[PDB]
Design a protein around this ligand. Sequence first.
Ligand SMILES: [Ca+2]
Ligand SMILES: [Ca+2]
Ligand SMILES: [Cl-]
Ligand SMILES: [Cl-]
Ligand SMILES: [Cl-]
Ligand SMILES: [Mg+2]
Ligand SMILES: [Mg+2]
Ligand SMILES: [Mg+2]
Ligand SMILES: [Mg+2]
Ligand SMILES: [Mg+2]
Ligand SMILES: [Mg+2]
Ligand SMILES: [Mg+2]
Ligand SMILES: [Mg+2]
Ligand SMILES: [Mg+2]
Ligand SMILES: [Mg+2]
Ligand code: NA
Length: 212
Amino acid sequence: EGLDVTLLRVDLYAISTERYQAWWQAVTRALEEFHSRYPLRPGLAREELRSRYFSRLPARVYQALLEEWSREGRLQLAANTVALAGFTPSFSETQKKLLKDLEDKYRVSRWQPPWVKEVAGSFNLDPSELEELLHYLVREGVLVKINDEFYWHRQALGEAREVIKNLASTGPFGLAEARDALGSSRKYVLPLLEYLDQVKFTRRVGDKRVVV
RNA sequence: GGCGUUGCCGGUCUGGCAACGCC
Ligand SMILES: [Ca+2]
Ligand SMILES: [Ca+2]
Ligand SMILES: [Cl-]
Ligand SMILES: [Cl-]
Ligand SMILES: [Cl-]
Ligand SMILES: [Mg+2]
Ligand SMILES: [Mg+2]
Ligand SMILES: [Mg+2]
Ligand SMILES: [Mg+2]
Ligand SMILES: [Mg+2]
Ligand SMILES: [Mg+2]
Ligand SMILES: [Mg+2]
Ligand SMILES: [Mg+2]
Ligand SMILES: [Mg+2]
Ligand SMILES: [Mg+2]
Ligand code: NA
């Protein structure tokens, strides 16, 4: 697979229908096994799926292969996992609601997310039941863990990375100037930047940062 | 088998192994 018949879109892409339907044959198997073993996980990690069956073909074509199958109503895609169309994790109906509400609290809070502490108080939850739900949201890619008390919704993180790219485009920036850019405060921005250092999105040099 | 906790590992976690708890 393949050259550049089942045809793709990425600039076009023949793949011998022969092996396009083998490609989807394996995907159904993997995902059934996975959903079957992990009914409380949102799906197979994307890179696990790729590494497992698609290391062969290049990253931007794999993207399109997922993109098309979702389009055909065959896959449900998340920021960082794939699942089959009608898969539904088996949490209690109370927990399903909690997943919706946790997501919302983090979305609406945006650049000033609550701490885990606050959340557990306000949702009236065991640390342990909260850990299960935060964990699934993290597997799924809906929340991202900045440090032991701050999670960020992925939209909020994505939008703060653009803000940082803008800020850095005029040259190295300080913590205060990043706080200005986000109209936020040092309590939130410091953890954000430390997080972005760790994943190598920014890199810190004295009191200044740049975008790598 | 999952899921949690704790411990241990491998610089690290969208982890791995073991014990324990609940399912
Ligand atoms: Ca899902
Ligand atoms: Ca979700
Ligand atoms: Cl993505
Ligand atoms: Cl992200
Ligand atoms: Cl980027
Ligand atoms: Mg696994
Ligand atoms: Mg933005
Ligand atoms: Mg740092
Ligand atoms: Mg950090
Ligand atoms: Mg497992
Ligand atoms: Mg621990
Ligand atoms: Mg240790
Ligand atoms: Mg040892
Ligand atoms: Mg785990
Ligand atoms: Mg025993
Ligand atoms: Na199970």
